[PDB]
Amino acid sequence: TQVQQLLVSITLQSECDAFPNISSDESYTLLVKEPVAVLKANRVWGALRGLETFSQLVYQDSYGTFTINESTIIDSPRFSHRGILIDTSRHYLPVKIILKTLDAMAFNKFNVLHWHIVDDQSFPYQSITFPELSNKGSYSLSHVYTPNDVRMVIEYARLRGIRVLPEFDTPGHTLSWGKGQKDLLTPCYS
Amino acid sequence: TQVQQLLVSITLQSECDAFPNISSDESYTLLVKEPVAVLKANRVWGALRGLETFSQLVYQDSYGTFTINESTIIDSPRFSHRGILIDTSRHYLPVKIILKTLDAMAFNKFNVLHWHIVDDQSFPYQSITFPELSNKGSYSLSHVYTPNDVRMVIEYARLRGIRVLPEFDTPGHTLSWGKGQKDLLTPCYS
Amino acid sequence: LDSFGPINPTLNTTYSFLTTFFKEISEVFPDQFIHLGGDEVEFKCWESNPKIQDFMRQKGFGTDFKKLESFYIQKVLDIIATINKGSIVWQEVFDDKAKLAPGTIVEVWKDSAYPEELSRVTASGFPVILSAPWYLDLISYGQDWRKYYKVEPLDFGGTQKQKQLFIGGEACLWGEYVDATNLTPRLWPRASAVGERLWSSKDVRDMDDAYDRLTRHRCRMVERGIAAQPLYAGYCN
Amino acid sequence: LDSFGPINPTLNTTYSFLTTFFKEISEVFPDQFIHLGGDEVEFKCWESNPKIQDFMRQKGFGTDFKKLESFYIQKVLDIIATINKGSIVWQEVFDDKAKLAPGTIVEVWKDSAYPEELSRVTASGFPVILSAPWYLDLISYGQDWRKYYKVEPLDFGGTQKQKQLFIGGEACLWGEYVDATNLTPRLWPRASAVGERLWSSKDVRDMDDAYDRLTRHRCRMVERGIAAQPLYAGYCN
Amino acid sequence: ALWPLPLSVKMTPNLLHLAPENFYISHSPNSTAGPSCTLLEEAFRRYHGYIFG
Amino acid sequence: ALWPLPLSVKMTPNLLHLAPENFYISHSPNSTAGPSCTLLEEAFRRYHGYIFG
Numbered sequence: 001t002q003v004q005q006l007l008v009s010i011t012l013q014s015e016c017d018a019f020p021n022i023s024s025d026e027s028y029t030l031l032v033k034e035p036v037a038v039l040k041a042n043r044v045w046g047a048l049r050g051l052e053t054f055s056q057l058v059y060q061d062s063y064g065t066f067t068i069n070e071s072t073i074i075d076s077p078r079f080s081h082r083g084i085l086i087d088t089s090r091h092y093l094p095v096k097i098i099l100k101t102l103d104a105m106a107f108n109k110f111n112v113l114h115w116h117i118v119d120d121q122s123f124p125y126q127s128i129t130f131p132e133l134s135n136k137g138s139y140s141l142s143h144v145y146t147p148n149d150v151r152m153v154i155e156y157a158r159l160r161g162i163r164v165l166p167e168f169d170t171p172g173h174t175l176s177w178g179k180g181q182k183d184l185l186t187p188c189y190s
Numbered sequence: 191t192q193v194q195q196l197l198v199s200i201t202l203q204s205e206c207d208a209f210p211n212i213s214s215d216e217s218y219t220l221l222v223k224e225p226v227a228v229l230k231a232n233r234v235w236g237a238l239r240g241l242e243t244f245s246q247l248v249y250q251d252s253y254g255t256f257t258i259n260e261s262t263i264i265d266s267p268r269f270s271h272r273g274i275l276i277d278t279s280r281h282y283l284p285v286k287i288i289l290k291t292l293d294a295m296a297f298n299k300f301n302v303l304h305w306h307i308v309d310d311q312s313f314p315y316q317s318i319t320f321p322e323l324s325n326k327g328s329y330s331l332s333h334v335y336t337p338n339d340v341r342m343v344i345e346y347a348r349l350r351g352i353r354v355l356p357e358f359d360t361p362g363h364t365l366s367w368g369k370g371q372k373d374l375l376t377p378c379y380s
Numbered sequence: 381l382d383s384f385g386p387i388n389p390t391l392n393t394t395y396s397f398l399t400t401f402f403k404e405i406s407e408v409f410p411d412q413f414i415h416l417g418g419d420e421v422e423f424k425c426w427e428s429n430p431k432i433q434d435f436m437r438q439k440g441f442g443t444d445f446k447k448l449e450s451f452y453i454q455k456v457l458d459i460i461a462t463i464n465k466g467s468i469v470w471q472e473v474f475d476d477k478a479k480l481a482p483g484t485i486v487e488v489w490k491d492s493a494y495p496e497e498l499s500r501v502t503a504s505g506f507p508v509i510l511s512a513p514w515y516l517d518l519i520s521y522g523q524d525w526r527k528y529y530k531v532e533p534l535d536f537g538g539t540q541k542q543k544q545l546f547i548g549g550e551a552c553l554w555g556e557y558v559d560a561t562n563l564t565p566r567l568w569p570r571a572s573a574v575g576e577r578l579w580s581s582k583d584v585r586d587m588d589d590a591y592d593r594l595t596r597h598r599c600r601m602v603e604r605g606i607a608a609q610p611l612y613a614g615y616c617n
Numbered sequence: 618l619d620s621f622g623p624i625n626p627t628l629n630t631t632y633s634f635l636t637t638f639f640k641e642i643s644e645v646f647p648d649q650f651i652h653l654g655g656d657e658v659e660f661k662c663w664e665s666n667p668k669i670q671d672f673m674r675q676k677g678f679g680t681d682f683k684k685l686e687s688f689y690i691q692k693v694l695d696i697i698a699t700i701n702k703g704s705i706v707w708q709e710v711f712d713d714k715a716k717l718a719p720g721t722i723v724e725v726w727k728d729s730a731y732p733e734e735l736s737r738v739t740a741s742g743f744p745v746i747l748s749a750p751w752y753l754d755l756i757s758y759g760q761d762w763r764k765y766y767k768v769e770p771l772d773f774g775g776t777q778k779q780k781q782l783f784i785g786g787e788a789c790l791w792g793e794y795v796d797a798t799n800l801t802p803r804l805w806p807r808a809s810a811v812g813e814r815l816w817s818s819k820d821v822r823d824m825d826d827a828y829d830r831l832t833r834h835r836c837r838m839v840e841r842g843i844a845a846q847p848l849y850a851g852y853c854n
Numbered sequence: 855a856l857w858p859l860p861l862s863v864k865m866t867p868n869l870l871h872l873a874p875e876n877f878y879i880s881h882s883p884n885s886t887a888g889p890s891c892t893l894l895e896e897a898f899r900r901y902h903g904y905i906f907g
Numbered sequence: 908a909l910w911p912l913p914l915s916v917k918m919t920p921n922l923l924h925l926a927p928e929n930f931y932i933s934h935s936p937n938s939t940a941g942p943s944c945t946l947l948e949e950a951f952r953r954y955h956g957y958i959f960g
């Protein structure tokens with residue numbers, strides 16, 4: 001009656017310290033049995049997906065008893081690019097709500113955060129080589145993503161098997177770029 | 191330069207301990223001057239509206255200085271029934287979010303909460319004379335409004351000059367009523 | 381087609397239940413008015429019921445179930461009058477030719493030809509409340525606050541006397557798709573559009589000025605703990 | 618008509634800025650791909666500019682500003698290739714006849730005739746991402762999760778080879794009307810519809826079963842601190 | 855930034871200042887309401903918080 | 908209540924139980940990953956919270 005353990009077996013080079021990419025292997029199998037359940041996956045990426053599925057199989061019965069059915073699951077994604085686009089130019093989004101979105105993405109097996117980071121209305125990306133882009137283009141100084149904010153989002157995403165795809169849109173959608181980079185934008189005669 | 195005081199003058203019988211009604215007088219005048227500003231209203235209801243307006247006139251300048259312009263405001267509503275309908279049957283709404291809605295209503299000078307309390311899907315109104323209506327009709331026992339929940343919403347609303355208009359819809363929209371009141375609903379042959 | 385339909389209006393136990401029930405309501409809720417509803421009553425269940433069919437011919441209602449609806453509603457209105465409260469009713473009760481006592485407020489919610497509904501209701505002497513163009517549960521893309529703001533509620537046909545019977549309106553947030561997770565952002569500041577239209581003068585309708593004050597007001601709501609959603613791109617503070 | 622238009626593609630300072638800038642981006646973001654955008658470029662400003670008019674005739678682009686857009690984009694793609702990253706581009710870059718290096722991903726976002734866009738892009742050899750039918754910022758009344766769920770992304774015309782070039786999709790939540798107050802309820806669980814369509818088998822499309830599992834899943838998101846909005850009337854726990 | 859816009863608004867360019875710990879909202883001596891009025895007392899206190907908070 | 912629905916799901920009617928303070932998620936001894944794997948270690952700990960919390 002008791003599942004005492006969920007053992008996790010990675011079969012090939014784990015890719016534990018790597019960033020995920022388009023071809024990352026997200027396949028896994030999950031064998032739920034007593035006394036030891038087993039999650040097997042080629043890489044880390046598949047184990048992450050399998051942990052999510054395992055958690056969706058455990059439930060509490062009417063008396064509060066944690067229960068799970070003996071089962072076998074074989075799973076792998078139909079498509080490898082599964083994205084959510086967020087836009088932090090039209091409105092600044094605090095780092096916390098980006099981290100929450102990544103948590104929700106993991107629960108849904110989404111693997112790409114398409115970060116539409118800048119646009120016409122504001123330029124929150126703080127550039128090291130070009131400090132004036134954000135200093136003059138952001139909505140205010142508290143509506144900026146520091147190098148450390150960016151690293152945090154990237155790392156937080158990586159820990160859930162999520163790729164961070166940055167979008168720096170050009171040549172259109174660049175009005176905020178012109179505040180800090182002089183002579184970049186075309187002046188309009190009218 | 192300093193406004194030291196906002197004096198509030200109610201001219202007629204205040205209606206302080208009464209519930210507002212359709213004909214309640216919500217007119218007021220607000221004279222902002224130094225050293226004493228004056229809010230004058232026929233009744234309590236108008237003073238409440240005038241307090242909201244006074245707060246919308248105070249602002250902080252670029253250095254954080256609390257500022258207000260010398261001014262005179264004469265105000266009274268175009269229509270006396272200004273409502274928000276909420277529906278707590280399709281989904282139960284916790285008392286807290288009803289209280290927050292009342293706060294937002296006050297900030298917007300709304301004066302009627304149209305409480306569509308029951309409908310087909312659930313019956314959260316706990317009736318004293320008919321305990322089975324909610325016991326069998328609610329989504330669960332924690333999705334009920336106790337007599338005390340109801341009093342709290344009524345009092346909270348009254349303190350903002352807001353009328354609580356209950357809707358107990360019949361003869362349609364009554365499926366949840368039938369769980370606890372036997373022989374009330376018409377059985378369907380098909 | 382379902383299992384149970386509307387309240388059975390042919391039984392004395394119904395009205396005895398409603399009497400006792402509404403008496404409790406007259407004590408719990410101090411407001412002068414009680415909304416009795418009366419919207420979207422389905423007749424298929426009443427039509428398919430043999431005891432109702434019997435009752436229908438017992439007093440000559442034929443095959444017209446509007447008369448049975450009227451019969452039911454008139455008894456409920458009478459219960460409200462006997463406990464000394466006013467009644468509010470959705471437009472169907474008026475449209476289906478029920479006899480309403482003077483004072484009965486009619487709430488107009490159907491978006492089709494609503495001005496003409498306002499004319500009819502007021503022409504018949506009744507006070508009216510408008511909700512038809514302000515269904516905040518009916519969400520859509522963009523600045524829909526403007527369409528709610530642009531409504532001029534007294535643009536219907538009628539004399540001054542009829543226009544004096546228009547006592548106000550309500551912005552409605554029905555609950556099929558709304559709960560604690562989304563109520564506040566959906567409600568505010570879209571409901572603020574209706575609030576100005578119902579408070580301020582008729583001629584207050586400059587859109588640019590409305591946009592200017594509403595973004596700032598919305599930021600104020602946010603500062604005060606109301607998570608009111610944005611009007612357009614921007615920031616607060 | 619405005620004050621400033623798109624990036625000036627005729628200046629060497631532009632490309633020198635973009636080189637230095639994108640080099641920084643190639644170091645900050647470890648992903649293999651960088652999205653260069655290229656959507657909705659306005660030509661009126663370029664058309665009205667005398668120095669651009671001069672540049673246009675300098676290499677025979679006539680009055681065709683798609684060629685100037687192409688010229689600009691090709692230089693940016695070359696910068697990305699030189700730093701050893703892949704490029705992603707909105708469909709306009711492909712539609713306006715720019716020369717794309719093999720490997721360049723094209724993101725199809727225009728809702729008009731999108732299947733035929735998928736055919737064209739894939740027929741030309743390029744990998745494709747679909748976003749057109751999954752604009753979550755375009756809100757509407759009711760159970761719109763179903764329309765996102767019912768999309769079958771490979772229902773476009775083409776050979777197997779072309780269908781192998783379809784690598785996935787994105788659910789987009791553009792920000793004009795979205796901030797911290799409303800992002801989460803707007804995003805979830807509507808984006809969960811797209812997530813199943815992109816993860817699960819093609820033949821997983823039983824609507825009743827999808828509704829059953831998604832309400833429970835949505836309740837799970839709520840239990841875990843994600844304020845996902847309801848699908849319909851109901852409760853959690 | 856008034857919402858709803860009041861019926862009649864007349865302002866001067868003269869700015870006045872307020873001091874949070876030296877600004878009170880109180881009953882005018884001629885008023886029909888006083889300290890007994892819970893409704894006005896609670897409103898005084900919460901609007902003090904809204905103005906300064 | 909799986910979302911997304913896995914490619915292949917086969918279950919039995921046999922119910923098994925779990926004890927929160929006596930249920931661990933760990934590395935199988937044959938695995939290529941171990942305690943050094945921050946990614947797996949953090950996932951083990953947060954999924955423990957999701958299953959029981």
Ligand SMILES: *[C@@H]1O[C@H](CO)[C@@H](O[C@@H]2O[C@H](CO)[C@@H](O)[C@H](O)[C@H]2NC(C)=O)[C@H](O)[C@H]1NC(C)=O
Pocket residue numbers: 259865866867868869
């Ligand atoms: C409230 O008072 C302020 C300060 O006098 C007014 O603002 C200024 O108005 C004067 C003359 O009209 C201008 O010279 C200034 O440029 C304005 N701003 C500043 C920084 O002083 C403001 O208009 C008044 N409010 C209203 C609506 O009357």
Ligand SMILES: *[C@@H]1O[C@H](CO)[C@@H](O[C@@H]2O[C@H](CO)[C@@H](O)[C@H](O)[C@H]2NC(C)=O)[C@H](O)[C@H]1NC(C)=O
Pocket residue numbers: 069918919920921922
């Ligand atoms: C998981 O196991 C449970 C318990 O055996 C399954 O549920 C029952 O199934 C049996 C036979 O199929 C029925 O007699 C019971 O009515 C079901 N419920 C109860 C309370 O025991 C459940 O179907 C299993 N899950 C799956 C999808 O296979």
Ligand SMILES: CC1=N[C@@H]2[C@@H](O)[C@H](O)[C@@H](CO)O[C@@H]2S1
Pocket residue numbers: 419420470489515517518554555556
């Ligand atoms: C009166 C009304 N009765 C109906 C309600 O039951 C729905 O919830 C609402 C949703 O828009 O539509 C009409 S308005």
Ligand SMILES: CC1=N[C@@H]2[C@@H](O)[C@H](O)[C@@H](CO)O[C@@H]2S1
Pocket residue numbers: 656657707726752754755791792793
């Ligand atoms: C690519 C795209 N470019 C545009 C964006 O700038 C808008 O924000 C979005 C809103 O729906 O519409 C299209 S999608």
